[PDB]
Amino acid sequence: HTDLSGKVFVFPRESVTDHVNLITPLEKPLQNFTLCFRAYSDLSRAYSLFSYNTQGRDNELLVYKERVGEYSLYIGRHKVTSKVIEKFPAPVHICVSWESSSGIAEFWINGTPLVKKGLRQGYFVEAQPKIVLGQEQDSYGGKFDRSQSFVGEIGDLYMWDSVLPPENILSAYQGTPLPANILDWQALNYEIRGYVIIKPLVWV
Amino acid sequence: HTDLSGKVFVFPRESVTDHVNLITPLEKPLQNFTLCFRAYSDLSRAYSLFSYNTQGRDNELLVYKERVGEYSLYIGRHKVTSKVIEKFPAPVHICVSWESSSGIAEFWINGTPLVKKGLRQGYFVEAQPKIVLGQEQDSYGGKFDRSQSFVGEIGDLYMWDSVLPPENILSAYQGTPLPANILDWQALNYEIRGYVIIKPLVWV
Amino acid sequence: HTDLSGKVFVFPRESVTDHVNLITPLEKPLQNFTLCFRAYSDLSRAYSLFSYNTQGRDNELLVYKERVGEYSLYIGRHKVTSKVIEKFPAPVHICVSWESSSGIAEFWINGTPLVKKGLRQGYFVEAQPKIVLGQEQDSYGGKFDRSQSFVGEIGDLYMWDSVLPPENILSAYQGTPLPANILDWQALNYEIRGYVIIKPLVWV
Amino acid sequence: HTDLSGKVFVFPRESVTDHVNLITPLEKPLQNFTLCFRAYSDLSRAYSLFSYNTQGRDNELLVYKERVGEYSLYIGRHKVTSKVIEKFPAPVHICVSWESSSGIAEFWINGTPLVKKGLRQGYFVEAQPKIVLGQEQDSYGGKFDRSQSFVGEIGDLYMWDSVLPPENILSAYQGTPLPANILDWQALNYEIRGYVIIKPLVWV
Amino acid sequence: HTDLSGKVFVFPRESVTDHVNLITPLEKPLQNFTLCFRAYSDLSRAYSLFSYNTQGRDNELLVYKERVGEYSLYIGRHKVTSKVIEKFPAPVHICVSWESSSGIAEFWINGTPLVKKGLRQGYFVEAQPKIVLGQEQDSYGGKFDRSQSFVGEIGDLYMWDSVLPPENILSAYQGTPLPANILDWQALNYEIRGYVIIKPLVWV
Ligand SMILES: Nc1ncnc2c1ncn2[C@H]1C[C@H](O)[C@@H](COP(=O)(O)O)O1
Ligand SMILES: Nc1ncnc2c1ncn2[C@H]1C[C@H](O)[C@@H](COP(=O)(O)O)O1
Ligand SMILES: Nc1ncnc2c1ncn2[C@H]1C[C@H](O)[C@@H](COP(=O)(O)O)O1
Ligand SMILES: Nc1ncnc2c1ncn2[C@H]1C[C@H](O)[C@@H](COP(=O)(O)O)O1
Ligand SMILES: Nc1ncnc2c1ncn2[C@H]1C[C@H](O)[C@@H](COP(=O)(O)O)O1
Ligand SMILES: [Ca+2]
Ligand SMILES: [Ca+2]
Ligand SMILES: [Ca+2]
Ligand SMILES: [Ca+2]
Ligand SMILES: [Ca+2]
Ligand SMILES: [Ca+2]
Ligand SMILES: [Ca+2]
Ligand SMILES: [Ca+2]
Ligand SMILES: [Ca+2]
Ligand SMILES: [Ca+2]
């Protein structure tokens, strides 16, 4: 594991090639979780922020951006979308959390909570995933669509297996996150594929 | 009689099913009243905020939202609408009050008074009502329309039988409301029907 | 005479009926004057703010609102209009003054002077008028047009027979007006006709 | 020799008649100069701010306003236009300067310098001019066009025969101008013709 | 070898003639670099900010402005464009840097970093260039297009052969730049050609 503290992955161009493979020992199905990260991009079109597929399952867990001020979350091919007021272009800090028992999906854009939506109550996101950054999988680790490619910068990615409380969300947002157990920026296990440069985080 | 303090009812999806039944011993006709509550929703369409029907009377008392910055009040099937400047989406604090003698309906969005309008002077809203949250009744407790369904969060609901003065409105708005006698959030009598979760109020 | 201090006339609905008759001992023709009052309405259309007719003379003195940020003044059937930047809806404090010698009409929206315009230099507004609030006269005290009706609230009306200087305008605006001699809110002589309620001024 | 300090000329109506003739003490051809004044108008159309014609030459020196946020300067029938961000309606403080050697025209709207433009390098603006305020000359002191008439208020006019430095521009803007030698508000030689009133400057 | 400190080149008009030739002893190919400068223009169309051509190669290094809030960078005929929120018209401070090893182009508008883009990784911009200001070269020092001509003011130009870090960018922006080795405003070697005046920097 590498400590990417103070740095970010910069996907410099539109392609159906460049991407990063995040590696995690997720052996037991996900029931609860929280995902946080920063992104900076001036793309007007829709693009995938975080793709997570398992065998035979497309969009098992996908954080997709529809257009400005509109974020979508997919849980087992199901989808919820919540709106927010935001400038364009501008850096963003996203934290999305889901909880099987209630099915309640909760977005936190820049330390601000959006309206709660619910989906797939009592479902379990399948274990042993293929997590890619920069592209949107339509297969287990592949079948990328160019019009869904993310071009910009991504940093400070953390994923916990629990549903973080407001205090913990804001801390992450403020730069002092709790240690993550599913994916941690300070001990990341990745695989750079294609054209993707690592540079320091200058916009925070 | 449950204390929903620090919590809110979250209606997570559009449906013609989910709703909450508020129960109150209103056995003697309403002549004066004040209703206050918070709501957070990113729905662009129209939707009912508070439905109150009595036997044989539709829209006896309905707080309906026409569109952004436009609120309506129905008293015995009659209606008044007042405008306000507001952002979208964003949490809101609404207090509406009516007084039979003058017929004056008074809205207070986020501690700000909108222009007064008048309707049904000298009328009495029937007692023994059917009060639902999350749907719009077209019958006594039923006949819901999906296109009027409320999806988002609701909290801090209080209803007094008198017409509250400015200082009492602002207190409610500020989080220190006067004890209500028709409906009280700190001693609520409800019936969750369908998909509606209870979660803490994080947006205030 | 009645002291309407801290109160306002609220015209709660669109009609060709409701109005208030202001009674003033004006027996000698007007040569100079200043009018001030507050208004709060969310009407989008045009409406009359202050109508003043004399026998045979329509629009002898009329303060009419064309549309948002556009105020008109009629003096003996002649008209001037001046623009201002304003929000909608929102309470307003208006002061308009006219002086026969120069013909200079001067508007002051919310303590802010608009551009001066000129009309009817050397004219005298007839005395022994018919002053109505809430409707637009097309005859001596009558012939109301529904599409010109004012619906909203009006308060703090004062009318002097002289042309007030800036410091006196701002005082009125700040709530400490000079005693008026043609019409005074603290000693008003009115006649309510139709549906018009008196309530306290909550929006100032 | 009149001191118009603290006052302004108010042109109260659209006409092809009202105007003021400025008479200047200096009889030399112009090579360098600086002009400053305040204006307040809510006219949406184009209109002439300051007209200066000499026998046989139209638009020898003309400060014309094309539309909102767009100011033009004519030197010997030649023209330059520069843009600025501005509200409408709102009072303005304009200072324009030209210098024959370089041909550099320099505008300063509300103490803010616009982009420099250049015209008629090495030209000399004729002497024995006809300077009118409120109309746009198409002949020596005449041939006014109604659609170019200025209606609103003008005050604090000063004109030097040199090109004033930033400090001196800001002083004029702040109300403590350097003594002018071509035209001075505190010792103006004018000739009102038509309907134009003098009133105190209430908007500064 | 001139010190243009506190001054700027002002291109006063649209032409296919006026321009300035920057002279630099670049005999060895560029691999890394940083360019910074201020510009003030109210041109709505596209225009070239900085043209750099070598023998045989067009657009070897060109900083071109597409439209408002949209900046392009060309490296060896290849192009990247990045967006930013900005007012119009308004002065701007631009710093663009490129690094052959990664191919990462980095823009900094008014001390604010835009999203990184990448082009020509492992390329070397040819040495012994023809650098013009005010026009866009389509040949070695010539073939200007009128529709790409820059009209406005440019100042504080500096160009280093290294990729400056955030601190050094902000210093340049704040007026205390590091000494440049490829092009230095305080020791500039230029050649004015056509109508271009030098004046002091009044807008900073
Ligand atoms: N090529 C293309 N153009 C436009 N919109 C697209 C495209 N591919 C997918 N989508 C949309 C369809 C879904 O709404 C979302 C994820 O679909 P998924 O099927 O997982 O890619 O993206
Ligand atoms: N299905 C549907 N689509 C759009 N607008 C509707 C619909 N049903 C009612 N309304 C409108 C009609 C009334 O103006 C208001 C309450 O009507 P009420 O009759 O009490 O439902 O909502
Ligand atoms: N019914 C109606 N609709 C719209 N505008 C109207 C109407 N009646 C008058 N007006 C306009 C005409 C004048 O410009 C102004 C006052 O006219 P006065 O003639 O004094 O009413 O209002
Ligand atoms: N009547 C009229 N309507 C609109 N625009 C006009 C009119 N007369 C002149 N102009 C324009 C033409 C020039 O651009 C400017 C000054 O021209 P000058 O010829 O000095 O008046 O004003
Ligand atoms: N005349 C004209 N009008 C509009 N856009 C133009 C023109 N000439 C070039 N361009 C565009 C074409 C390229 O996108 C960019 C640089 O092209 P380059 O070929 O280096 O000039 O400018
Ligand atoms: Ca997919
Ligand atoms: Ca896809
Ligand atoms: Ca109904
Ligand atoms: Ca219904
Ligand atoms: Ca009339
Ligand atoms: Ca009428
Ligand atoms: Ca002319
Ligand atoms: Ca003309
Ligand atoms: Ca070229
Ligand atoms: Ca070209």
Structure, described:
- The structure is a homopentamer of 204-residue chains.
- Chain A has one helix and 16 strands.
- Chain A has one domain: Jelly Rolls.
- In chain A, strands 1, 3, 8, 9, 10, 11, 13, 14 and 16 form a nine-stranded antiparallel β-sheet that branches. A seven-stranded antiparallel β-sheet of chain A has the order 7-6-5-4-12-2-15, with no helix packed on it.
- Chain A is globular.
- The first copy, chain A, has one helix at residues 166-174; strands spanning 7-11, 19-22, 32-40, 47-54, 57-67, 70-75, 78-83, 92-99, 104-109, 112-113, 117-118, 130-133, 152-160, 183-184, 190-193, 197-200.
- With 204 residues, chain A is mainly beta.
- The first copy, chain A, is 4% helix and 44% strand.
- One calcium ion binds next to loops of chain C.
- Chains A, B, C, D, E: This is Serum amyloid P-component.
- Chains A, B, C, D, E: Belongs to the pentraxin family.
Care to give the gist of this entry?
It is classed as serum protein. Five copies of one chain form a homopentamer. Chain A has about 200 residues and is mainly beta.
Keyword list:
homopentamer, mainly beta, Jelly Rolls, nine-stranded antiparallel β-sheet, seven-stranded antiparallel β-sheet, 1 helix, 44% strand, binds 2'-deoxyadenosine-5'-monophosphate, binds calcium ion, Serum amyloid P-component (chains A, B, C, D, E), calcium (chains A, B, C, D, E), metal-binding (chains A, B, C, D, E)
